[PDB]
Design a protein around this ligand. Structure first.
Ligand SMILES: CCCCCCOCCOCCNS(=O)(=O)c1cccc2c(N(C)C)cccc12
Ligand SMILES: [Cl-]
Length: 291
């Protein structure tokens, strides 16, 4: 039974005029472990991983601005807006050195932060993360047509803003096991008002695919170059068939990235946390003990 509950007291901090919500559990001392979720999830995606880590480490898991239980201002919710809010969140909590556990757009946030603050990062655990996607040929027909549809201000907004397709359609397609309606309700909660679904649409329009948008492709190429040269301890989780990171890509990264341990979680698509939380949390705790 994969737990469906979210038993964490809410914490809030004011960041750039907006309230950001975060989970904060574990001992107050030591190096903190910072969990960054992506699209279209929240700290909820970490709920069954954090308990493997909280016995011996501080766990901080924020909700991105406009997502989860964080405030929802009238922004475009560009990656750049998320960079500003996450930078500020980390300083507002007074974090110095951290370990990162990051996923999907959370990973783009983490890597881009790590690149800009390499002396402050003691380890990075990552999974199903954002890397440049050279061609649409890498995706199957349905995914290709859907995400190409997403990347317009007409049909894309109709699908994601009006019809809430990213939550009701895409999200369960990123999990091998069937999500329950209780879990779905936790993922749905932040976007019950359609005007609040703006981040769900801007994120796929930011994905670095076949060279566009050029600025996001450049930013991501930068932090990937950094990641290939830094000796920071790395822990890569991957599954089969995977989505952003197919088994061949995981193998490549496992050998080419310095100081990288790779863990096969078994069956998985994008939300690896929902398919093997026990192994992911267990391995993160284990890996942490070696840092
Ligand atoms: C971060 C965001 C990126 C995505 C959350 O949802 C993840 C679902 N993504 S998807 O469009 O349905 C999708 C894309 C590419 C391949 C897919 C696939 N094969 C063929 C391995 C199976 C199922 C869905 C696939
Ligand atoms: Cl996305």
């Amino acid at each position: 039974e994969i737990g469906t509950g979210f038993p964490f007291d809410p914490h809030y901090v004011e960041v750039l005029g907006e309230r950001m919500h975060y989970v904060d559990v574990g001992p107050r001392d030591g190096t903190p472990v910072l969990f960054l979720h992506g699209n279209p999830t929240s700290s909820y995606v970490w709920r069954n991983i954090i308990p493997h880590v909280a016995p011996t480490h501080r766990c901080i898991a924020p909700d991105l601005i406009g997502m989860g239980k964080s405030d929802k201002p009238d922004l475009g919710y560009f990656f750049d807006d998320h960079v500003r809010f996450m930078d500020a969140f980390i300083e507002a909590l007074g974090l110095e050195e951290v370990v990162l556990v990051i996923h999907d757009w959370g990973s783009a946030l983490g890597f881009h932060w790590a690149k800009r603050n390499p002396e402050r990062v003691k380890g990075i655990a990552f999974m199903e993360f954002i890397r440049p996607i050279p061609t649409w040929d890498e995706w199957p027909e349905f995914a290709r047509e859907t995400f190409q549809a997403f990347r317009t201000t007409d049909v894309g907004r109709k699908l994601i803003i009006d019809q809430n397709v990213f939550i009701e359609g895409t999200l369960p397609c990123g999990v091998v096991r069937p999500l329950t309606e209780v879990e779905m309700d936790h993922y749905r909660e932040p976007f019950l008002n359609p005007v609040d679904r703006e981040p769900l649409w801007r994120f796929p329009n930011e994905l670095p695919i076949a060279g566009e948008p050029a600025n996001i492709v450049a930013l991501v190429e930068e932090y990937m170059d950094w990641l290939h040269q830094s000796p920071v301890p790395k822990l890569l989780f991957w599954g089969t068939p995977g989505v952003l990171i197919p088994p061949a890509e995981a193998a490549r990264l496992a050998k080419s990235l310095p100081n990288c341990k790779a863990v096969d979680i078994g069956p998985g698509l994008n939300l690896l946390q929902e398919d093997n939380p026990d192994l992911i949390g267990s391995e993160i705790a284990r890996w942490l003990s070696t840092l």
